[PDB]
Design an enzyme around this catalytic site. Structure first.
Site, PDB file in Angstrom:
ATOM      1  N   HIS A  62       0.751  -1.266   0.000  1.00  0.00           N
ATOM      2  CA  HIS A  62       0.000   0.000   0.000  1.00  0.00           C
ATOM      3  C   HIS A  62       0.789   1.331   0.000  1.00  0.00           C
ATOM      4  O   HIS A  62       0.186   2.401   0.112  1.00  0.00           O
ATOM      5  CB  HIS A  62      -0.986  -0.020   1.169  1.00  0.00           C
ATOM      6  CG  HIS A  62      -1.802  -1.279   1.232  1.00  0.00           C
ATOM      7  ND1 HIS A  62      -1.444  -2.360   2.008  1.00  0.00           N
ATOM      8  CD2 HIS A  62      -2.936  -1.640   0.584  1.00  0.00           C
ATOM      9  CE1 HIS A  62      -2.332  -3.325   1.855  1.00  0.00           C
ATOM     10  NE2 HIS A  62      -3.248  -2.911   0.997  1.00  0.00           N
ATOM     11  N   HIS A  89       3.801   7.836   2.763  1.00  0.00           N
ATOM     12  CA  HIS A  89       2.528   7.637   3.429  1.00  0.00           C
ATOM     13  C   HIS A  89       1.708   8.855   3.055  1.00  0.00           C
ATOM     14  O   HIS A  89       2.223   9.963   3.049  1.00  0.00           O
ATOM     15  CB  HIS A  89       2.670   7.567   4.955  1.00  0.00           C
ATOM     16  CG  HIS A  89       3.581   6.486   5.460  1.00  0.00           C
ATOM     17  ND1 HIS A  89       3.774   6.270   6.805  1.00  0.00           N
ATOM     18  CD2 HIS A  89       4.395   5.611   4.820  1.00  0.00           C
ATOM     19  CE1 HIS A  89       4.643   5.295   6.974  1.00  0.00           C
ATOM     20  NE2 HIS A  89       5.035   4.876   5.788  1.00  0.00           N
ATOM     21  N   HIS A 106       9.225   8.244   4.322  1.00  0.00           N
ATOM     22  CA  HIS A 106       9.940   7.691   5.453  1.00  0.00           C
ATOM     23  C   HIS A 106      11.240   7.051   5.028  1.00  0.00           C
ATOM     24  O   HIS A 106      11.279   6.216   4.144  1.00  0.00           O
ATOM     25  CB  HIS A 106       9.053   6.716   6.215  1.00  0.00           C
ATOM     26  CG  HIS A 106       7.947   7.393   6.967  1.00  0.00           C
ATOM     27  ND1 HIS A 106       7.785   8.762   6.982  1.00  0.00           N
ATOM     28  CD2 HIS A 106       6.948   6.892   7.726  1.00  0.00           C
ATOM     29  CE1 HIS A 106       6.729   9.075   7.713  1.00  0.00           C
ATOM     30  NE2 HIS A 106       6.202   7.957   8.174  1.00  0.00           N
TER      31      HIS A 106
HETATM   32  C1  LIG Z   1      11.149  -2.466   5.033  1.00  0.00           C
HETATM   33  C2  LIG Z   1      10.334  -1.434   5.775  1.00  0.00           C
HETATM   34  O1  LIG Z   1      10.730  -0.291   5.828  1.00  0.00           O
HETATM   35  N1  LIG Z   1       9.123  -1.832   6.392  1.00  0.00           N
HETATM   36  C3  LIG Z   1       8.275  -0.963   7.117  1.00  0.00           C
HETATM   37  S1  LIG Z   1       8.452   0.535   7.385  1.00  0.00           S
HETATM   38  C4  LIG Z   1       7.264   0.978   8.231  1.00  0.00           C
HETATM   39  S2  LIG Z   1       7.004   2.638   8.776  1.00  0.00           S
HETATM   40  N2  LIG Z   1       5.953   3.186   7.687  1.00  0.00           N
HETATM   41  O2  LIG Z   1       8.197   3.420   8.746  1.00  0.00           O
HETATM   42  O3  LIG Z   1       6.503   2.805  10.105  1.00  0.00           O
HETATM   43  N3  LIG Z   1       6.413  -0.139   8.434  1.00  0.00           N
HETATM   44  N4  LIG Z   1       7.077  -1.385   7.730  1.00  0.00           N
HETATM   45  C5  LIG Z   1       6.581  -2.719   7.694  1.00  0.00           C
HETATM   46 CL   LIG Z   2       4.265  11.367   9.376  1.00  0.00          CL
HETATM   47 ZN   LIG Z   3       6.604   4.643   6.615  1.00  0.00          ZN
END
Ligand SMILES: CC(=O)/N=c1\sc(S(N)(=O)=O)nn1C
Ligand SMILES: [Cl-]
Ligand SMILES: [Zn+2]
Ligand SMILES: CC(=O)/N=c1\sc(S(N)(=O)=O)nn1C
Ligand SMILES: [Cl-]
Ligand SMILES: [Zn+2]
Lengths: 221, 225
Positions: A62, A89, A106
């Site tokens: 996603h 995000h 991120h």
């Molecule tokens: C490989 C990797 O970065 N996985 C991630 S990053 C993440 S986050 N969006 O930084 O909190 N959630 N997950 C499963």
């Molecule tokens: Cl954020």
């Molecule tokens: Zn993230």
């Protein structure tokens, strides 16, 4: 292949129910994201970024992700954290003093002991920023991505301990949320949101147990 | 099947195995105690005001490897418009948190709970030295079945402390704990030191230093009274 952002069963309020590995999504006391409202004023933070060509660029689970070779580093308190990937995000997950921007990216890092360092920075609706383009033309060679130019040279940030904002919601995460918004054009916004299937991929604010937050500043390049 | 600090199966390395309620003792990412070496200096926006008075313990007794004095809900701590009532004061020998890798022969924890169960523990180390007058009322209440505790006199007026979120240092290792570790060590006599270890049955109740996931710590100072 179960968890999503849909407001019904596989939604975030039920992630712990979808799988036991996500149990910490509920049981943890440092779950992210949150609204940064109380903090303490006060670098020791070194970027080792370069324009880099992605090992792979793909939309997975996603979000839009660019994975990378272990060539770009962040050193924090005398420990090197390797950038694994940058993904996006929408909308922004973290909030600062009740403020929201429509997008963030991120920057995910891991050190020698496997500990996580993630960076959240915003995009602001306005002028088209060029940094986006090497990845948005990477569906198939892959063009180099301007990492050392992506972030502001001068940054004000919030630092605290949290969790992943996505399952398994693992904790032990050093968050650095950058105050300065980057800029994003309205055409780029809608366009990339379409790779986000114009379906939000933003975890809601988690319960806050008096997280200790420092506000500081640094120079990236 | 009960938890200890002893070398074999019921030790700290194995608390998680003893009870499923104790799973977070190993798996948690904000486990205490830790070695405090990296922190952030800050100003005193710190909203931490003490509301302590001399109080007679509901009880002074040995439980779970420590000497504990529980109290009437009469003594308080205020933190950012959030008031935490003192539950009990208990002891660790040696001191469990480390300040820049330095070891104290003893510590005290001021354990608080708000209405919704939020935890605030206050830690201070003790250093061998002068007769501590506050200690013996505790050492004078444990064989009985209680004298006022000069809580109003117990802590220093001016304290340098470190603040962060951690866990309880004994099972169930509950996280979401607001720790305040005070830098200035209190004073204790050699026999006050010796005797109490025997009331804590001369079996160390010090959890080893836990893995630190870059805990964000601030250093500040304050006036209690
Ligand atoms: C490989 C990797 O970065 N996985 C991630 S990053 C993440 S986050 N969006 O930084 O909190 N959630 N997950 C499963
Ligand atoms: Cl954020
Ligand atoms: Zn993230
Ligand atoms: C009632 C009470 O204070 N219990 C406690 S306190 C504590 S500690 N050593 O302060 O983290 N561990 N446990 C189990
Ligand atoms: Cl301690
Ligand atoms: Zn204790």
């Amino acid at each position: 292949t179960k968890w999503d952002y849909k407001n019904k069963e596989n939604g975030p309020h039920r992630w712990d129910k979808l799988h036991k590995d996500f149990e910490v999504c509920k049981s943890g006391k440092s779950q992210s994201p949150i609204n940064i409202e109380h903090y303490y004023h006060t670098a020791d933070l070194q970027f080792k970024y370069a324009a880099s060509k992605p090992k792979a660029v793909f939309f997975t689970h996603h979000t839009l992700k660019a994975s990378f070779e272990p060539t770009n580093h962040i050193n924090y308190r005398g420990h090197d954290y390797v950038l694994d990937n940058v993904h996006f995000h929408a909308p922004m997950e973290f909030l600062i003093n009740n403020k929201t921007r429509p997008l963030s990216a991120h920057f995910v890092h891991k050190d020698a002991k496997g500990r996580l360092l993630v960076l959240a920075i915003g995009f602001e609706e306005g002028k088209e920023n060029p940094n986006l383009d090497p990845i948005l033309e990477g569906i198939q060679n892959f063009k180099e991505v301007a990492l050392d130019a992506f972030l502001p040279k001068s940054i004000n940030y919030y630092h605290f301990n949290g969790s992943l904002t996505a399952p398994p919601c693992t904790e032990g995460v050093a968050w650095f949320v950058i105050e300065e918004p980057l800029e994003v054009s309205a055409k780029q916004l809608a366009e990339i949101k379409k790779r986000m299937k114009n379906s939000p991929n933003q975890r809601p604010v988690q319960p806050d147990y008096n997280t200790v937050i420092i506000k500081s500043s640094a120079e990236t390049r």
